[PDB]
């Protein structure tokens, strides 16, 4: 019963967060085995941040320039390297709290949990989605650089996001743990705009299934539509197209509710064209698109 | 960007255990050498409708309780019942015990919930104690015993232990002293909650949030009395404002330079005139599950 924006328990990641400092620049890092991962922007001074020459800047550094702090303890850096936009610091002590983990690059529309950290201290946890324009609508303040996003599958932590910067519109940009940015952004202190965003249609449908499971059904109708006819209306409203794979992945929700996917699409089409008429769905006046079909199945089963 | 942000759950994850009595199983909270859980665990299927807890507990011994941290058994060496919580003394002090206290939260306040099943944490989310002393949580069967909490630097304030779901789908529970929030009892019967109302103090915090972010079209040059506003609020199914609410709005009042009673008069006009097709923070609805501290917490 109920439906909330639910994040994974963050304990396994909290045990990995540390503080990285270089000169006066400081941000958060991720301590896994005997390696600390953090954004390379940490090696910039104010004069460097606007237009960094990262390769030269890293050559001009030594292990003794990096200050790594796990709580009130200092970790000794014995080696450093750069992988795209992520700095890799080898330390002489392996993190005893390292969980089973892997690095994954998520696709637009997928969700993950974000552990917001400041000066190496976890501050809050929330659930986000990778937007179609490769930004995330996070909640970050100054000092959040290096916070990570993740999913947990059984006992394995999948790290998928490392936070880097805020954009002028208030959305956020970052990389995977290989250091490759999501979207067309660069780790420079310049004003960078994102492309026009779209709505994650498959997630809206899963959320509508969530609404039905919780007894909210006013938006249902007795009509169905074709995948193509629905996609034509979706694109007109800046909604992402629905693929047959999406229809398949919604199968468990359709089977649970007895409402065919294309039946639910006809309800979404009417919502797009007529709006909610002052109504709400799961307490929302807007169509939520940051719940994947798996999140719904997970939270309602 | 404004998100419903929960506290990091690690400090609480290290305290979640499973408690089983016969085949009845739920979650417990392991702090120092004591485990706290709902007393409903001593019920068999046929006792859940109308249990005699005194009688059911008299026929229990330490060796009838199975406490497990993961697959590791913690032997129960003593037990006690306080209100609707059971306190089980175990032979192991939890080495992961954080700094903690027990607190009873007030209506309208928020907290993080660590949803657990069979002693295994499953998810974390933020929610508010509604004015009718229910919470609009997200719980499935087996979530009994999950806890709600707030963290103050290094101190964990435990404020909620989940017990049951009501016919309307909302949830009811106790503080960690075992005292229910609201007029509910731990029986498997249909219990209706009082009529819910909107958390006025949180709507006000949200309006201050909008002003901080540059959304100010709804301000007016009028003020009102606290009493006059509270009388009008009840007419619109809004909760009356308490002196604590006026107090906690102070920092937002000072940050924007807009007096509390001044912002109340702006809200009063919104209630009477509506938004006229306008939006506040990109929303057509007024959010009431963000407290003044949540705003201070997320907006510097
Ligand atoms: C308001 N907000 C929302 N998200 C963020 C994240 N963020 C951040 O936390 N820090 C940044 N710059 C730094 C300044 C520093 C000053 N000192 C002493 N140490 C500092 C360390 C950092 Cl990282 N930035 C800006 C930024 C960070 C990058 F990694 C990047 F590639 C480009 C950028 F413009 C930032 O966005 N703040
Ligand atoms: C769908 N949903 C939403 N929230 C809840 C919470 N919840 C729960 O998890 N369990 C409950 N009853 C039990 C049944 C058991 C069967 N076995 C084998 N072991 C069991 C243990 C419990 Cl606790 N209930 C019902 C319930 C639990 C109480 F603590 C109470 F005082 C009255 C009640 F009606 C429940 O609501 N399920
Ligand atoms: Cl640029
Ligand atoms: Cl007054
Ligand atoms: Mg239909
Ligand atoms: Mg006014």
Residue numbers in the entry:
A (entry chain B): 1 to 301
B (entry chain A): 2 to 301
Paper text:
The structures of Mpro QM, E166V/T21I/L50F, and E166V/L50F all show a symmetric homo-dimeric assembly very similar to that of the wild-type enzyme. The electron density map shows that the substituted Val166 in the active site takes the rare gauche+ side chain rotamer (χ1 angle = +60°). The E166V mutation abolishes a direct polar contact between Glu166 and the edge of the triazole ring. However, in contrast to the case with nirmatrelvir, the substituted valine residue does not cause a steric clash with ensitrelvir; the Val166 side chain is positioned 3.7 Å from the triazole ring of ensitrelvir for a favorable van der Waals contact, which may explain why E166V confers less drug resistance than E166A specifically against ensitrelvir. The S144A mutation in the QM also causes a loss of direct polar interaction with the triazole moiety of ensitrelvir (3.5 Å between Ser Oγ and a nitrogen atom from triazole in our Mpro E166V/L50F-ensitrelvir structure), although it does not significantly affect the positioning of the inhibitor. Overall, the structures suggest that the Mpro E166V and S144A mutations affect the binding of ensitrelvir via loss of direct polar contacts.
The main/3C-like protease (Mpro/3CLpro) of severe acute respiratory syndrome coronavirus 2 (SARS-CoV-2) is responsible for making 11 out of 14 cleavage events for liberating and activating the viral non-structural proteins essential for the virus replication, and accordingly, it is an important target for antiviral drugs (1–4).
